[PDB]
Amino acid sequence: PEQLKHCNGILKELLSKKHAAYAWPFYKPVDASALGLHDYHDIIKHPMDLSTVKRKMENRDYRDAQEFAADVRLMFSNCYKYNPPDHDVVAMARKLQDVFEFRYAKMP
Numbered sequence: 686p687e688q689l690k691h692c693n694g695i696l697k698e699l700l701s702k703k704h705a706a707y708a709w710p711f712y713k714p715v716d717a718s719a720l721g722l723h724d725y726h727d728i729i730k731h732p733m734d735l736s737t738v739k740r741k742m743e744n745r746d747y748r749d750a751q752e753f754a755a756d757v758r759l760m761f762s763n764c765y766k767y768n769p770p771d772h773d774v775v776a777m778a779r780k781l782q783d784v785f786e787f788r789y790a791k792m793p
């Protein structure tokens with residue numbers, strides 16, 4: 686209960702303007718067609734993004750904090766999985782994950 690309330694606050698920061706410089710690629714699902722990706726959905730089997738997490742939050746689909754954090758980390762993993770480590774989107778994912786993992790750790 687109060688746990689899921691904290692998760693809601695974390696999500697607002699990930700979407701806040703303070704982190705928009707490196708968090709924008711994760712606002713909406715990967716549009717493989719718009720990006721020219723031909724193997725994204727064959728390799729990434731369970732896509733995830735901040736709007737989908739926000740939706741599941743609003744529909745009260747998360748039962749605890751652990752279920753919420755599982756989706757957020759999966760979002761970063763898909764980015765790490767599909768892209769080589771030298772790509773900048775991986776660096777943006779690492780920057781945003783360090784923000785998430787820090788705030789998530791400071792949860793009561």
Ligand SMILES: COC(=O)C[C@@H]1N=C(c2c[nH]c3ccccc23)c2cc(OC)ccc2-n2c(C)nnc21
Pocket residue numbers: 709710711715716720722763764767768772773774
């Ligand atoms: C060429 O390879 C790709 O298109 C992969 C794709 N690239 C970026 C991106 C974002 N800054 C970048 C800098 C250099 C290279 C790629 C990028 C991107 C952009 C988006 O804007 C709507 C939305 C999703 C992503 N996104 C995610 C999340 N995970 N992978 C990708």
